[PDB]
Design an enzyme around this catalytic site. Structure first.
Site, PDB file in Angstrom:
ATOM      1  N   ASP C 171      34.358  48.578  43.295  1.00 15.06           N
ATOM      2  CA  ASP C 171      35.679  48.957  43.230  1.00 15.06           C
ATOM      3  C   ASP C 171      35.825  50.101  42.313  1.00 15.06           C
ATOM      4  OD1 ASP C 171      38.472  48.212  43.623  1.00 15.06           O
ATOM      5  OD2 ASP C 171      38.885  46.983  42.006  1.00 15.06           O
ATOM      6  N   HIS C 271      36.354  41.775  47.243  1.00 13.45           N
ATOM      7  CA  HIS C 271      37.266  42.924  46.996  1.00 13.45           C
ATOM      8  C   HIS C 271      36.517  44.425  46.848  1.00 13.45           C
ATOM      9  CE1 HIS C 271      41.145  45.263  45.788  1.00 13.45           C
ATOM     10  NE2 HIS C 271      40.227  46.148  45.014  1.00 13.45           N
TER      11      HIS C 271
HETATM   12  N1  LIG Z   1      46.544  43.877  39.948  1.00  8.15           N
HETATM   13  C1  LIG Z   1      45.624  44.748  40.298  1.00  8.15           C
HETATM   14  O1  LIG Z   1      45.782  45.859  39.950  1.00  8.15           O
HETATM   15  C2  LIG Z   1      44.367  44.383  41.174  1.00  8.15           C
HETATM   16  C3  LIG Z   1      43.370  45.163  41.511  1.00  8.15           C
HETATM   17  C4  LIG Z   1      42.229  44.664  42.145  1.00  8.15           C
HETATM   18  C5  LIG Z   1      42.361  43.423  42.694  1.00  8.15           C
HETATM   19  N2  LIG Z   1      43.663  42.676  42.362  1.00  8.15           N
HETATM   20  C6  LIG Z   1      43.437  41.273  42.778  1.00  8.15           C
HETATM   21  O2  LIG Z   1      42.527  40.433  42.200  1.00  8.15           O
HETATM   22  C7  LIG Z   1      42.125  39.376  43.028  1.00  8.15           C
HETATM   23  C8  LIG Z   1      40.264  39.154  43.194  1.00  8.15           C
HETATM   24  O3  LIG Z   1      40.184  39.213  42.088  1.00  8.15           O
HETATM   25  P1  LIG Z   1      38.382  38.944  41.820  1.00  8.15           P
HETATM   26  O4  LIG Z   1      37.244  39.478  42.664  1.00  8.15           O
HETATM   27  O5  LIG Z   1      37.919  38.918  40.329  1.00  8.15           O
HETATM   28  O6  LIG Z   1      38.310  37.118  42.367  1.00  8.15           O
HETATM   29  P2  LIG Z   1      38.763  35.856  41.612  1.00  8.15           P
HETATM   30  O7  LIG Z   1      39.859  36.021  40.576  1.00  8.15           O
HETATM   31  O8  LIG Z   1      39.087  34.706  42.673  1.00  8.15           O
HETATM   32  O9  LIG Z   1      37.503  35.216  40.880  1.00  8.15           O
HETATM   33  C9  LIG Z   1      36.177  35.414  41.350  1.00  8.15           C
HETATM   34  C10 LIG Z   1      35.349  34.049  41.125  1.00  8.15           C
HETATM   35  O10 LIG Z   1      34.492  34.470  39.885  1.00  8.15           O
HETATM   36  C11 LIG Z   1      34.140  32.821  39.160  1.00  8.15           C
HETATM   37  N3  LIG Z   1      33.049  33.040  38.344  1.00  8.15           N
HETATM   38  C12 LIG Z   1      31.795  32.480  38.080  1.00  8.15           C
HETATM   39  N4  LIG Z   1      31.415  32.780  37.006  1.00  8.15           N
HETATM   40  C13 LIG Z   1      32.479  33.284  36.464  1.00  8.15           C
HETATM   41  C14 LIG Z   1      32.610  33.703  35.175  1.00  8.15           C
HETATM   42  N5  LIG Z   1      31.632  33.791  34.140  1.00  8.15           N
HETATM   43  N6  LIG Z   1      33.585  34.331  34.835  1.00  8.15           N
HETATM   44  C15 LIG Z   1      34.937  34.354  35.686  1.00  8.15           C
HETATM   45  N7  LIG Z   1      34.571  33.845  36.668  1.00  8.15           N
HETATM   46  C16 LIG Z   1      33.531  33.332  37.187  1.00  8.15           C
HETATM   47  C17 LIG Z   1      35.579  32.645  39.244  1.00  8.15           C
HETATM   48  O11 LIG Z   1      35.665  31.162  39.241  1.00  8.15           O
HETATM   49  C18 LIG Z   1      36.254  32.926  40.437  1.00  8.15           C
HETATM   50  O12 LIG Z   1      35.896  32.054  41.704  1.00  8.15           O
HETATM   51  C19 LIG Z   1      42.683  39.531  44.215  1.00  8.15           C
HETATM   52  O13 LIG Z   1      43.739  38.657  44.489  1.00  8.15           O
HETATM   53  C20 LIG Z   1      43.190  41.203  44.138  1.00  8.15           C
HETATM   54  O14 LIG Z   1      44.315  41.416  44.843  1.00  8.15           O
HETATM   55  C21 LIG Z   1      44.473  43.036  41.769  1.00  8.15           C
HETATM   56 ZN   LIG Z   2      40.336  47.920  44.057  1.00  5.06          ZN
END
Ligand SMILES: NC(=O)c1ccc[n+]([C@@H]2O[C@H](COP(=O)([O-])OP(=O)(O)OC[C@H]3O[C@@H](n4cnc5c(N)ncnc54)[C@H](O)[C@@H]3O)[C@@H](O)[C@H]2O)c1
Ligand SMILES: [Zn+2]
Ligand SMILES: NC(=O)c1ccc[n+]([C@@H]2O[C@H](COP(=O)([O-])OP(=O)(O)OC[C@H]3O[C@@H](n4cnc5c(N)ncnc54)[C@H](O)[C@@H]3O)[C@@H](O)[C@H]2O)c1
Ligand SMILES: NC(=O)c1ccc[n+]([C@@H]2O[C@H](COP(=O)([O-])OP(=O)(O)OC[C@H]3O[C@@H](n4cnc5c(N)ncnc54)[C@H](O)[C@@H]3O)[C@@H](O)[C@H]2O)c1
Ligand SMILES: NC(=O)c1ccc[n+]([C@@H]2O[C@H](COP(=O)([O-])OP(=O)(O)OC[C@H]3O[C@@H](n4cnc5c(N)ncnc54)[C@H](O)[C@@H]3O)[C@@H](O)[C@H]2O)c1
Ligand SMILES: [Zn+2]
Ligand SMILES: [Zn+2]
Ligand SMILES: [Zn+2]
Lengths: 367, 367, 367, 367
Positions: C171, C271
């Site tokens: 990212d 992502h």
């Molecule tokens: N608002 C923004 O600017 C922005 C930017 C990029 C992405 N997003 C959004 O973020 C979402 C994806 O985020 P993601 O990739 O982090 O996925 P996610 O939020 O679903 O979390 C990923 C997984 O990591 C797990 N896991 C295992 N060990 C962990 C630990 N120590 N700590 C935390 N989690 C642990 C979590 O339970 C989770 O299942 C999407 O909905 C995306 O659209 C938003």
């Molecule tokens: Zn991004």
């Protein structure tokens, strides 16, 4: 003596450019004889007809006989007269384009040139290579004028066989080294003067573009899609190489290409593929630094161009064959005499054998 | 959209080139209308007549009225018709050459262009600037074709007032910076497309040639003799700057030149002298690095070009005058809108005052 | 127009930082709604409860439903109201953090954001991505304010699966190239203005940090320990990438990421993994120099990011699938139109196929 | 310990930005207390009133008493309560802005900050310097939050006295050298942690921007017009210097500034002018290479900043005065102890005398 640069009046390049032919051609003339090879008309005749018709132009389609010959030029002139054509559009590869240029010269009318491959630097030059109907070389027809317009649809080029883009890279590769040799020796160019700064800059730009963009462009060509790298290589193979060779100068690489007609071995290979090995041979002949020859050999190898005799299917009785090639390369009037310090057939023969050994070693180290 | 480069069909330059006009022109046409300003015909008419006569060409000499106007074009067309002229040769400075190009366009005949000074990039372009008879600007006449041939006798140029070579340096100085701005913004050029690699290379070659050769060339010009440095600057002021501006793009420098017609102050100064200060202003406007502005200001200073308002005799009520210039520079359709990120009159006004202060400081430190 | 940079009010990072949450949060508010995903609360709820309790803060723990949806935001608002919460703390990955930000926006209260992985640049932005409960994308909720505070416990991050740190590298890799493209085109950023120097510097710092520290950081991540290299990559994946994308600009890489929702193939990939290949595709599209693409491909390969379609499990009927991706990437309002010179679906399609071939060749040469 | 960076939530800069205040402020609050100094309201009150009124916001204008004092904060709080203000806008120089920040802290409401000069790095920091009504320093009020928004109208800044932009350059000049010293010593910053990579990058960007743009910006300032160079220096003097000092660290330069309140001599000189000489003194103290001190002294000299004691009107009994300054600079809690290896008053005294001699020699060689 004077320094002279020549150019087509307008060079146009981009994806879908065939669709805009009519609007580009309308300021020049209203009734167009369209010389096209049958394969190209197979996919392009409908688009081309629409472009000209929508712009209010008449189009008399004349399928090309295949050879740039005096008989074919007169045949097309007769066809053009029946339709009262006032200009000529050639669309296809080098033989089609040379025929259109020569035809327009003899009709004394403007010519537009639409390359559907970027395989040689023929499109832009004030030159047609005349052959007999059987395909034997006949003469160089020097023209008083470069084409009025050149229009390259890069999507059509990208759709063509990728080997034909690599061949154009081979033809364009010679441009810098032959123009540089002519500038070192003070040789007269085909534009009839000494070289301009403009022509040397375009020749060197040609080479650097191939180095920077060649491999990226071949990826696009193999996928038959257009990227900016393919766009830049098309410009280098067409405009830069064309002005570069004609107004910057020819030397050993092209004399060596011409010399290989003294043997039958390389008959299946394209103009630009033979010119690539001629360029490697010139580098041996002028004793280019090791790093420069390696860079050229690696560029050739990366786009599939030959760097050995065997890759041109020149095999067996190499000494006799390379003596034939060397002697014809040094024939009276050949451009090899534009090399600094002069060159004779013994030196060309030596360079041919050594360039071949260099390429063999390169291929070996590449495994 | 497509990428397009335009060029005169053949550009020729060297000492004594006027003596070879007849042989250069003969492949084009047999009966030539020669538009020349009276001063130029004063020294060149005999040589020119001999060159054409020896080559078997007819020459109808038509002394130029001084202004590129519609009335003058029709007057010359009438004269040409009486002599059954089939081509036009313009010989002189920019106003003569623009008239020859426009006349040949309306007669629908080839045009040859013989600059006797290298003071602007007019010779090569597919453009004539039309004025009223009184000399007020009237319109830009865009031509469907660049000139067939351009022939620069560098000995005639070297014999001309040295100030006129410096003026050409000023016009040519803008070429790289305006083409670079257009390439950064993606602006459409006067060739009607986006920029080619070829045009950007010639534009940058133009600038580097001025840096490397400008001072050496002015020494030759002041002695009214030809050296290779003067030869290279003539090429840069004519071919490189011409193709560079037309096929690489115009931007702030020329809009600022045009804007100064909103005041009477700079009336005694040549086109290229005003363009030099327009170029310094563009560099402030695009916030060029300090070293780049200093290099340009030093180049201008070394060949006598203005780097302050007062050196253009723009003195008194500077705020009101620069507001007039800034507003006209930003008029609808002006090329200043080709600058990256857009530009308004407040920004141009600021750049004008700051560029003027920069030049004043430069002159001060030079003592 | 104005130049604008946005930022979270305070960004905090270090090992054991969860233990200091209470003291960091106390100046903001006294009663905290804690949105956390169940896995994170499994290991962190006791430490978090202690930190807040020791600082005299109330904590209402609300296990997160898994999706950032309007129904989930209203559910949490109801829970928060029962406990009279005056602020929101989100702790977890991107979906948890987006939910906390949106919830705090609708309650009109401060928000603190505690990423427990460094997998995306979501933590710092004034943006929540809203989904339906089923997980289909719904809308972008633009927030009037960035989070008040962001607190990254780098020991918790280092303990997480190493694949999720590599995803964050993917990212963050896009940040420099998309901000640079926006600065070249003059595009408006999500902060609502043109780019500041500050934002471009942080975007470029982001890229150089990944180049210098990425491989060292992945060694630490695979051992689940904290080194300064891992610390620097966490900062790059979170603060630098966050401010970089929001205040420096988005372009092709993220439009291409969004375009892959038009096919089901890459559903198992994170992502940041899809954004890595989108970045390689953008480099083909903008025709980056060979050395730059190779550097990016090698960086991706060294941390396990995909450089081919098949590494995203995109296999079979590639032409149809890449046409779907290219068309959705170019949909109205997508950020791909921030690329210099504009882009259409044909160009994106070409770049996708060529970027895929580039990665395949890279993997081949790596054996 | 943790690494921490703080920032205003949104930083906005451009010409005419005052006209857009209402739309920028509306997402924050509806009823604004506007603290402005009488001179600024003299020219800005009408535009400001229109901007807020057009956006549907209430504005209670409260002319500023001149000093950031506890009595003045309570006076303005009373005025704000009568109008039921829900946010504070400070518009003016540093004393006005510090008062607005402190007032909003005590009302517990958002604050927007509109600098009308770029004379210090006060606008962005979570800090107010409290004085008695008579103007004697009282205390540093550390704030729990940076300002919500900072809005710099660069046209208003450019219209201000040019000396005040140079003063801002002097304040910003210290940023890189003090943050670099803190990073070398591992000192805690005012953000309460060790330095981030982000803060060091903005601090170094600050310095390079001044080197590259300072002289160009002063030309614009003296003409009271806006160029991109002036825009970049405003960003450097405000956002870069603000985040740089607060999150990157303070060291000797600012302790030396503070030390000069131990003598009355420099009372007529601005904050940033004294900081410029403090920076030269720090460079002597840390034994910076000769080329670095020369570069800083030349930058200071080129924008009118003092590089000698006499240019701060510190003349007569220099040994006694510099002992007073050195002792106060080293007082308990001063930031000079953030220098690598520690520093005592004897070393500061030595550096003061030597920095003064260095500047005198520099001025002499400049003639
Ligand atoms: N608002 C923004 O600017 C922005 C930017 C990029 C992405 N997003 C959004 O973020 C979402 C994806 O985020 P993601 O990739 O982090 O996925 P996610 O939020 O679903 O979390 C990923 C997984 O990591 C797990 N896991 C295992 N060990 C962990 C630990 N120590 N700590 C935390 N989690 C642990 C979590 O339970 C989770 O299942 C999407 O909905 C995306 O659209 C938003
Ligand atoms: Zn991004
Ligand atoms: N006048 C000059 O300056 C100059 C320079 C170089 C070469 N030449 C001459 O050009 C001739 C060789 O030209 P060439 O190498 O292009 O061979 P060519 O003209 O015979 O054409 C090559 C083949 O490409 C085929 N093809 C398949 N797909 C195509 C597509 N999309 N578009 C166009 N063609 C497609 C064509 O039908 C053709 O058979 C020679 O006669 C050479 O002497 C002239
Ligand atoms: N069409 C284009 O692209 C283009 C570009 C630039 C300028 N222009 C136009 O060119 C005009 C200005 O051209 P210019 O600056 O050359 O002025 P100009 O054409 O009026 O000629 C300048 C003077 O040089 C005199 N002179 C003295 N010795 C001479 C010598 N050896 N040779 C030639 N002339 C000699 C000429 O008689 C003339 O008075 C303008 O009307 C301008 O709009 C056109
Ligand atoms: N909180 C921080 O982080 C921080 C940092 C640095 C300085 N400070 C404090 O800031 C104070 C000094 O600030 P300053 O140097 O800006 O002095 P200042 O606030 O007293 O203002 C300087 C003068 O500029 C005048 N002026 C003329 N034209 C003006 C125009 N267009 N716009 C605005 N003002 C104009 C103003 O009326 C004012 O008299 C000090 O009290 C200092 O302690 C605080
Ligand atoms: Zn060839
Ligand atoms: Zn001009
Ligand atoms: Zn300060």
């Amino acid at each position: 003596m004077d320094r002279i640069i020549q150019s087509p009046g307008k060079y146009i390049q981009g994806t879908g450019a065939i669709k805009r032919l009519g609007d580009y051609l309308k300021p020049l003339a209203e009734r167009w004889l369209v010389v096209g090879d049958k394969f190209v008309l197979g996919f392009a005749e409908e688009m081309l007809r629409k472009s000209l018709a929508d712009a209010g132009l008449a189009a008399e389609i004349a399928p090309f006989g295949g050879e740039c010959s005096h008989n074919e030029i007169n045949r097309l002139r007769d066809i053009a007269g029946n339709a009262k054509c006032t200009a000529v559009l050639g669309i296809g590869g080098g033989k089609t384009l040379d025929t259109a240029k020569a035809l327009a010269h003899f009709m004394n009318v403007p010519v537009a040139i639409a390359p559907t491959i970027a395989s040689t630097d023929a499109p832009c030059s004030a030159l047609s290579v005349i052959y007999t109907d059987e395909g034997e070389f006949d003469s160089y027809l020097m023209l008083p004028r470069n084409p009025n317009m050149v229009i390259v649809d890069t999507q059509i080029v990208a759709g063509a066989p990728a080997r034909l883009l690599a061949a154009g890279i081979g033809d364009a590769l010679a441009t810098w080294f032959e123009a540089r040799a002519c500038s070192r020796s003070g040789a007269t160019t085909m534009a009839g003067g000494k070289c301009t700064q403009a022509a040397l800059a375009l020749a060197e730009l040609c080479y650097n573009t191939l180095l920077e963009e060649g491999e990226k462009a071949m990826l696009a060509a193999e996928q038959h899609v257009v990227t900016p790298a393919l766009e830049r290589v098309v410009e280098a193979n067409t405009y830069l190489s064309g002005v570069g060779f004609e107004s910057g100068g020819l030397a050993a690489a092209h004399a060596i290409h011409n010399g290989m007609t003294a043997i039958p071995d390389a008959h299946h290979y394209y103009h630009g593929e033979k010119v690539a090995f001629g360029t490697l041979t010139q580098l041996v002949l002028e004793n280019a630094p090791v790093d420069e020859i390696e860079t050229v050999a690696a560029l050739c190898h990366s786009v599939g161009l030959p760097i050995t005799l065997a890759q041109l299917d020149i095999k067996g009785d190499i000494p006799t064959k390379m003596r034939l090639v060397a002697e014809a390369a040094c024939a009276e009037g050949e451009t090899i005499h534009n090399m600094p310090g002069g060159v004779d057939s013994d030196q060309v023969y030596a360079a041919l054998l050594v360039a071949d050994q260099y390429g063999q070693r390169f291929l070996q180290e590449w495994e």
